[PDB]
Amino acid sequence: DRVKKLINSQISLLIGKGLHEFDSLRDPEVNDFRTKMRQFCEEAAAHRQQLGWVEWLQYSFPLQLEPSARGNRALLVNVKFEGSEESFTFQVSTKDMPLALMACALRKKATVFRQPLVEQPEEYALQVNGRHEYLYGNYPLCHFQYICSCLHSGLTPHLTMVHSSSILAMRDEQSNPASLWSLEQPFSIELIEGRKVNADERMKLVVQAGLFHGNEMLCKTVSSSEVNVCSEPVWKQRLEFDISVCDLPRMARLCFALYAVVDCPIAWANLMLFDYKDQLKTGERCLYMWPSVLLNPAGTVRGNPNTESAAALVIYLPEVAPHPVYFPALEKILELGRHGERRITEEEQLQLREILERGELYEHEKDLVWKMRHEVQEHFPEALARLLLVTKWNKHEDVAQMLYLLCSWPELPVLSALELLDFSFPDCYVGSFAIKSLRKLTDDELFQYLLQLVQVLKYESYLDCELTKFLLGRALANRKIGHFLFWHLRSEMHVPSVALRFGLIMEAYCRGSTHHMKVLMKQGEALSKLKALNDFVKVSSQKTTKPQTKEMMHMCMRQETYMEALSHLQSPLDPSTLLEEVCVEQCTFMDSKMKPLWIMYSSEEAGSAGNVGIIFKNGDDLRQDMLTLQMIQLMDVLWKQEGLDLRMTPYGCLPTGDRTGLIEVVLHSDTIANIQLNKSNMAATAAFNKDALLNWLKSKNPGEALDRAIEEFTLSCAGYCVATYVLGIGDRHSDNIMIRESGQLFHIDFGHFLGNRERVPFILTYDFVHVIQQGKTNNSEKFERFRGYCERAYTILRRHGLLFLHLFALMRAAGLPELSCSKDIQYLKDSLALGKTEEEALKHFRVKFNEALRESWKTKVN
Template sequence: MEGHMFECVNQAAVHEELEDETRRLCDVRPFWPMLKLVTRNCGRAERLLDSKIGVLIGKGLHELDALQDQEVKDFRSKMFRISEEKMQQVQLMTWSEWLQACFSPQLEPGGGATPVTDGVNDKQAEASLKVTMHFDQSQVQVRAGLFHGTELLCKPAVSSESSGRSEHVWNSTLEFDITVSDLPRMTRLCFAVYAVMDKVKKQKSTKNHYPVAWVNTMLFDYKGQLKTGDIILHSWSSFPDELEEMLNPIGTIQTNPYTENTTALHIHLPDYNPHPILFPPFDKIYLYLSDGGKKFHIELKEIMERDPLSQLCENEKDLIWTLRYDCMENFPQSLPKLLLSVKWSKHEDMAQLQALLQIWPKLSPRDALELLDFNYPDQYVREYAVGCLRDMSDEELSQYLLQLVQVLRYEPYYDCALTRFLLNRAQCNRNIGHFLFWHLRSEMHMPAVAVQFSLILEAYCRGSIPHIEVLKKQVEALSKLKSVNELIKLGTIKNARSKTKEAMLTKEAMMTCLRQSGYTETLSDLHSPLNPSVLLSGINVEKCRYMDSKMKPLWIVYNNKLLGGDTLGIIFKNGDGTRGCISMVLIMNHWNKMCLCRIVPYGCLATGDRSGLIEVVSSADTIANIQLTSSNVAAAAAFNKDALLNWLKEKNSGDALEKAIEEFTLSCAGYCVATYVLGIGDRHSDNIMVRSTGQLFHIDFGHILGNFKSKFGIKRERVPFILTHDFIHVIQQGKTGNTEKFGSFRNYCEQAYLILRRNGNLFITLFALMLTAGLPELTSVKDIQYLKDSLALGKTDDEALKQFRQKFDEALRESWTTKVNWMAHNVVKDNRS
């Protein structure tokens, strides 16, 4: 055993070393029932740790070992050294110090040797191209552009047209109108390959270019050295909508790992000097500085108070840059607008900006979040932003952790300030480490981030070795739940002709599966992925079921020793996206802390490719079920305004009823405003729920930012938000003339709306940071425009309140259309059952 181990080919078709002999073959699931005995290359303890980490993160470390990438090797070497130091510090801690570090209570307040050459000012950047393509087109062209963030640094270069079948060669040079010395450190070289189609007569559109592939690369490597020589770039074929110049600067700088059927661009970047060209460090940049003028202009205040989506014209940019010292002294939070005013194609401006950053006042962490957007790629800017984030409490960091993980995609190099910040905070607080692990692991199936995220996951595990077994247990449990879900889907397909027989046989098969010792053992005594402070002791099999929707989500009920014997429910979804739901739940939970409205916080977590967990809110039912149980006729149930109030009366008596109605009023106000501002659609009576204690809450946020459902071209939802007469009946305590209670409710809504407006810039920033999260209704800045309109940003409070009052009156006036929709939903549901 000390000298040998087994190896297999796993389900992902890669070699996996089986170091952990406690794993069973049914958990290993080799692709073919064959194991190979191989000789160990190093110590058993080290190999065992590597094996555990590989299984845990979903990518064998031997795959990282096999990458011929010096940046990967250097990053892993640095992180290995840091992790060793971290674990040595942990071993020297007392028990109380270790508990404080790993489980800190939420009580804290918010709060080179190579010569540098720069004698290339008169030399233009050149790149000769050779392109090999695996598709047939009669004519193709290549377009190339240099970008800093989304700013095009100079006019794009376009190749001549090339005719051929599978290989296209250009023996010409693409030139860019910018000197090498003016290239920003974070310059991206972006390529687009497109077919040139013959124009069709009588066709109104003049477009004759069809995009085929795109790929990006950094001009400077991770060490700051200008790239030279031959480079092969394997491109991507999925194009975002409305690409400017058909180039995709916001896309990944990783080349496509699936090289077999991709377009390959062979480019050559020339040498300019006998020595490598390094981007100069700050002390060298400082030599370029020139004196800046200092004056004040009254226009500045108006410009600086605009929201993040507002565009700046060239005159305004020039004004901001001229008055940059006034900005620093009077509007420090305006740094993003100053950065958008920098001429990044001039090294003098870059030098001025980087010097200014050294003396710029520290921003609040919330304001600094915007600087991590794709529009601000400069290394010094991002380091400054991360420096501001260090003032975040652990609780505040947890609120923004999902967004911070998403903006890791914008980091062109593995070793960066944001990565180190997240790793440090995660290794100092296990709760943060838990969610960092799952936010990263849930996207390991995406080839553009697989290497980057696996490197961070490996670094976290090496620095948090005691946490590995805890997380490994969760990963194994989710694998078991996925197997159960697949079993149910298979059973429902086989018995599709008889619904009664299907339900009975499939439910029985599910329970038999859950009772097996292998499943019982794996699914018991684990920390909940939704909340690591909750210990899930054992499954209550009799209460488990699967839900009647297309992907057959599992409804798993746990006994919980730590909650006085109460049960705890978890929904496992597989094959259905949960990311949109997660984003909305997190944002609503965050908003809950800003105002008095009772937004019901519940857990929601993506765990893999279209899979995730949702916390079951206890003692709650849907509006549809409450209405249907009060009426014998499904069609009439939606129009029974007494059903909801009677249900609350059954659950509460005396003073408890008055308290429940107050909770209902506040929570209804919160969700009215939240669903309006966030543009949440598909609001039928099965995704609005009420707890027995009165709190109303919404679930299933599949349609956001005004993307409402329609049928036969007609919008099914015609109201700004859901405010039906049975809701008002509860708010008015069943008394038709109780205008005082309704007036209070309306006032709650207005106050909540004004609070949201005051935090409008933050919400725009949070959505902007989620642009790469894969939400189908949030793919470009234009999608976020809905928020700007719903919050009436740019208007006074009085003007905004007038707009909201009009929407409120519209919701009241058109509430009958909601009832009609709900009636149709109840009838369909009744027929299904």
Template structure:
């Protein structure tokens, strides 16, 4: 028998080909109870394999009882260890990737077309729709039913379209511009909301380390009611309970708030923690160690107050900052991995024989008060409203804003977020007045409205108002902020919401938006907190965009193939680690053998680039790079543009989401500068996360790193970093005459842009291998693993001592090689100052965009403290003159301390030279 199939059939197939094996031994289970083992071509389609099986089965007993071949299909156990129906029989066996080489033949039910579509969608989104069918969740069922109905209606409208209408709908020009919380139920107003922990059982998370010689720790539960990050009342705490695995409390936790005052989006947050005594200097104190947390909404998706017994499976990863050890910003989804997590059993009491529903808002216009605020209060209000989003409001300021809310609406409509933070969400009268006021509030610009989607503003009417403002976005602007809009879906407690419907509608009207919506969602499907939510949205998109399915499916298959090639290279590298020459030769041979398989050549050719769907890729050439994760360097031809070559790097093992965010912000900076008539020649190359620690990066053509440029100009690596003529000489080689002057101007503008951008964003780990220059003169930075001031250090000493990179060889180029060329240097400095002031004017937007990414799980963006760096670098809260003075000091510091950069670069070059 051939070797057992590995977890990845592609890897196994590649090894088989190297060994001269073209067949795979597969076990087939027939519905008649007959078992057949047979060798089949590893690249055969499922349809062809079924035909081979059918011929073989004719010689076995009970064959006549099978009936027609078309009435059967295969099932397998996939990589996720669940059954998958192989309805799409055009797929190859090596693309199916079963967990083990076994296929089960089953009788096909009716509705084949629907089942085939379901199968394609399941493969495409990375989650079988049978998994969604199996969920015992009425909200999931209702959302899918509604989306199915909407998709059916949309596809019916598509069928009635003319050709030109259909083309416009599916292939629109790329980036075309374009209730009052009244008392809930009579007789309930005076009752307190209670969370009763009756017969509560907590199963310990086994990650807690306890000294077996010590008694087991005491365990407590803390509970809090939140609206956004605002505590609605004092948290409730259980008594301490001891035990090794289970803890039971027969008690009631009470909150000092009436049911009628609970806001619609109130959430109940729990923290479970161990309490251990600590004796120090004859003083005994208690230390609290967090064990787990979990959240749930107080009202369900239908607006009904939750009651009865609920089991909440909790999470054990805690963010850096927690208030009272509660995590209100965390997901309200319970942990799907129930076997190894702490389970909390709670009982929510019934207040009434009938369900208590949150009443719908009666949309009546509020009466405007006749009195206006005086001049003194107007000045004070203006000062408060002009603060940045990170500034805290004291209680007196909140009271003033709420009292003068109509003046805010009339004079400072963009200040709506600060008004919302001033509402007492624990008083239904205030909620009712706010929701009425929203009906007449002036529409905000889409950029200002983005802040309202932050976690701090969970109210349904507020978010619907924000989405209403976003509808004015052109497709180009929506594409600019799509990354954040996908992330804030995490803040939506219910699947059916205004933001979800908005994104689906715009995506189905513009395939370019649909393409990136698909990949932003698909790339995070492995995250348990969003897996169901994102799969529901992906399913809805696919059902409403059926012609797009095959295009996306080929991209998904191509990325799967590239991952297999990368894994094969890593495997070959490990096996031949002792001999570098032998490793390179054998690994390259295995890679080429793998890529020559017909299944690979077909899948990797004639596909639309995930980085840019308007590019059709063909004619692949591939090599691997000599870094830890062995990324693939791929060269394609763009079939739509006369065969121009395009470079793409495929990474497997690196999280590209932080790079993707940084490049998006650089793209926005470029846009803002251009809006102010300042083009700083930024190069925001393409970068797209496509899965768990995998993705694609665009290769910028005709470019080289500063390190390579310096090293080619010197025979000694240690001296290369100090050769100030190397860069200018390289540009002279690439350009002559007027072209050189233009290249130096390009270098000057782009250097100014990146100096300002890297300073404002706090981009660290800047060495000569992640700063590049194009032959046309444009300088640009790559690799953004450290942002927001998280600079690298060694032995506790910061390796980067400059606010941004501005070396003397850069200045040498800017001054055209003339030491006394102060005019050119003055222009460069002026570009930097202009660029900085433009970004300052948009400081609130940058803070908002980073705040909307807080729950994305980026390593260096986990709390509001991280975003504080932006406030400091942009000198928000200061005048332009004060800010400019601060920037000029940083500029002089960068120039004065540039020798430290050269020393770091020298060390980098020496290490690099020793490795090669």
């Protein structure tokens, strides 16, 4: 009673939408979703509460492994036991496993405490000090991201021996508190009227209507008659479509576009012809229209919630029978589809093989794919998508024949399944099949594609769907998946077209983890304070000097309400990172229009690794930055899987609200512009501005360390030259390029990509060529190694070209202005030269790299 009511108010506050608002809709689809998903998520919670202690570590602290390890050398490690000040430093091999390190620490504890211990190494796990990260399992130490990170930066790993009883105490502490196919007549509707229409009185109003199965028309579009512009237009007319009622596929959507003609677009509205319970819709429909920015088939099938101001179209769906009509059950479909004809010549089998291994077709090529559909299934199962695209979705007999093959189709690789999630495959059985083949995604692969899977929810026609159930089950089985699923949904609650769907998924998730709900509430409280703090800084920076606004920001942060809200939270950018003590004196803000905040933290428990920063931004939109950075990270994983480490810096970036988000601070780094300012009385001051970068590296890396820094610069420079070229990152200048004290170069500010439109050429800067060449004018040995790194990076990306294409195609659902159409996708197709052979693509890259070298030399002339 009192706990339920409190939890309900806590979910309302967390998701940014009162749960009573779901109840007020009196929507049976909303009610069934809420009841079935609450049950599903509570069942997941009960399974979790009884997990074994090692399984609970897999849930709460999933392993962070090196990409090359997924599916020798000496090392110094500092190990302590929980709640003990005392620690032990000892030598291990990078090939040693956590258990050997643990047995070693237990022998030391037994010698110091003078007693032969009862404890076996099997009863413990290794925590990374002051982090929600653990080392466990039969993996050598160098396979762990944390150990790998220490090895490269020279730092000593600091670990804590945590007993099973302590992990079990965590699990316990975090518990949830106790017949259609006979109807041959053409499809028709009555277009009754319009309400709250706003247009120029000199013009006339028209309603264009179309039937779609995804993006493809099921028949030609039909238009109403022209009627004089007014607030309440009255048509009362029959719109007849060239398709029989029996031929409407299950996922058929009726799409409307209201406009004014002398073309002046006004509004659009879509609806599914069948409901969530498979019933063919009849009766009057009031469609609350969305404003046009003509027909929008990809647009949401739910009405505009702003019923007070929105244009409304009133339609009538006729009663096609005196009894309700449902879409036929799978048994009936399989029965009709089971019947057909299966041959073809040795020459035409070569023609089919040619086009299936080849991707638009000519009409005759389509007919052969369809005729040879059984052979597509048995000998080319990976060509399923091609066959689905040749299926006549406007003929129920062909759809039955297609569904018959699909229902016995072998499971496809993850790559093939991602393509099938596109809106180009709108059928529900196709969608279910795609999810079935995605079930084999590892948590690491799932995390890599989570952003695209969340965007795909915007294409879904109904609330209760296989994709939502899949995402929820995986989120509830892995705390990190759960964390990012929550933030990707929460960051879009200000978007009315997704607020209901996203709000309902977050509620179900919360029912599955009351403890995680409170952990996320703590994060939301810090974000609420940062927004109030940022508003103060925006106002104050216009009235006074920078030192004054900064002192005022500090005084504001030092208030008890701010010190409480801003400290002791898991970072929204990374739940493994603990943001412990806010270091007010180190906090500041940037001089740009939105005055973003620079927030520093420290943790005595984590030591040096506890010194972390976040950038809070309110006013800018970080969605494209997050996507670009996720793509750069993916490049890093694919390169590392080929044994290529280009020493990349894919720092965290996460939208959290309406034009609000965080960016991970990379410490010990500066922009190229700041370094090239060549200030006097500094360790880097230069005789020639071209020496500035190398002198800065020299001051940071004395003696023998310079060699390693130049190499880190070269590797990262090759990675970023390739990444920015492939992704078409433009507006590159000295203040959006950074260098770490390690020598690593990295890019920032990804507000423009995919050419935005101009084809971005490969960029080679003389300043960077100068450092790669160790400061020498001529150094082809070092320069050409760098070219090899670029070529190797580029050829790896090309081999995974389809993965980038499939992911970017799914991202079109995000509604990013620079990722809206096929033209934007064509940019990636050209940058990766996907229509060519590897030798032709490498020849093309070489011409592009040489064109960038001749461009660079115009600066070398001076």
